[PDB]
């Protein structure tokens, strides 16, 4: 399930060929990377910044951080449609394996790799109608001190803030989100509701796992870092993961 | 040159699928990114860990750094032939594309793209003949305190060490390198010598820049994160970049 979907996460994005991108992590957590929305990087206190940060959602948007408001119309197209599933082999020793496993009761019965397919059909683009005149906000507005999130980030040097900019999402009938403001995009000719990932056995054709990807679900995103400055003011740079 | 390096090693990457392959800089530094090599990551001074760190060459190698010896013998064999040339976009105004602008020294004449093609011909991968065997002197070894990047490692915690395992490589006729230890490969029917990557003004073909990439030359590595304990034992672990 959650690895399966990571699957389908890692297959997008090896298929894309865009450096920037970030895999979403859980198909519950797909709203929370939709753009506009506020990621954290932690780097791990174990660690002397010599591994990568840890990416995590939040539950809150740049209108949550910012101290005058910022248009957050965003806007969809269509992106890319697979006609063929993506197909992989994962070893039952990896991350993704052994987490593939606990899916199986009684084990694999001695299987070393899984053969995974996605099919994705239609994969969309999500992005701010006007990016232009969300970074002008950027260079203008300060940061909310009464913001939990924004006196944390001020006072702790280990939280780093990213916006989410563009996100791939699988297609949806209408609106990709209800909590996002969505300018009403078109009902194009495309393939909704059939994006499914499934994982099977090497030894065993009839030992096979299956989740359904739901229409709407954010698959990967870019973003850029966001930087509170001790002035309270704002900068965006791009990222690269 | 240096930029249009970059983009016949971004090509490969992109060409690749592999997420923990990361970009040699310059034809120029391929020698200290072949496997054993050790590379240092410094964050820079500015950013609090919120940003990516910066990967540096370094002149060590992983002897240079063991109290005990460890086998150093390396293999190479063929990973793909490319047979037709990787053909990109580049916007002049992109970091890549001011770059290639500083060659052109009466300006591109309004030219807002470049047409990059990097033909790569035959790439081979260089790696360690038993990394079982590395593994387990990296397990058993301890690190030489009498080494000035040892001591500069053990003492500052902004320097992290990452041992290189893997390297893909422009062919060569014979060994990839006079400086390392190579076990005698095979005489294959492969492409060596024509590597070539050419970026032409999209409103003039007659203004192009090109680079030959000698042969044996380094575009792309993988490399494990090479931790010094407390006690000068050491550690690896599988990074992403």
């Known amino acids: 399930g959650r690895p399966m979907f990571a699957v389908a996460?890692?297959?997008?994005?090896?298929?894309?060929?865009?450096?920037?991108?970030?895999?979403?992590?859980?198909?519950?957590?797909?709203?929370?990377?939709?753009?506009?929305?506020?990621?954290?990087?932690?780097?791990?206190?174990?660690?002397?910044?010599?591994r990568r940060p840890k990416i995590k959602r939040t539950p809150y948007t740049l209108n949550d951080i910012l101290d005058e408001p910022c248009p957050n119309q965003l806007k969809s197209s269509d992106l890319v449609t697979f006609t063929e599933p993506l197909v992989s082999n994962v070893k039952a020793s990896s991350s993704i394996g052994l987490q593939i496993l606990k899916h199986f009761d009684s084990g694999a019965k001695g299987s070393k790799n899984f053969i995974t397919s996605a099919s994705l059909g239609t994969v969309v683009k999500a992005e701010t109608i006007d990016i232009t005149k969300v970074l002008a906000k950027v260079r203008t507005a300060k940061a909310k001190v009464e913001n939990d999130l924004v006196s944390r980030v001020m006072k702790t040097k280990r939280l780093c803030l990213g916006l989410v900019v563009?996100?791939?999402?699988?297609?949806?009938?209408?609106?990709?989100?209800?909590?996002?403001?969505?300018?009403?995009?078109?009902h194009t000719n495309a393939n909704i509701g059939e994006a499914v990932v499934t994982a099977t056995?090497?030894?065993?054709?009839?030992?096979?796992?299956?989740?359904?990807?739901?229409?709407?679900?954010?698959?990967?995103?870019?973003?850029?870092?966001?930087?509170?400055?001790?002035?309270?003011?704002?900068?965006?740079?791009?990222?690269a993961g």
């Open 201 to 239: 056995a090497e030894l065993d054709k009839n030992l096979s796992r299956k989740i359904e990807i739901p229409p709407g679900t954010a698959l990967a995103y870019s973003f850029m870092d966001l930087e509170i400055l001790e002035d309270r003011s704002l900068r965006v740079s791009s990222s």
């Open 9 to 50: 996460v890692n297959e997008f994005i090896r298929s894309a060929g865009q450096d920037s991108l970030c895999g979403v992590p859980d198909i519950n957590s797909s709203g929370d990377f939709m753009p506009l929305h506020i990621i954290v990087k932690e780097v791990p206190k174990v660690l002397p910044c010599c």
């Open 166 to 186: 563009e996100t791939a999402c699988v297609a949806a009938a209408g609106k990709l989100t209800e909590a996002d403001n969505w300018e009403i995009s078109g």
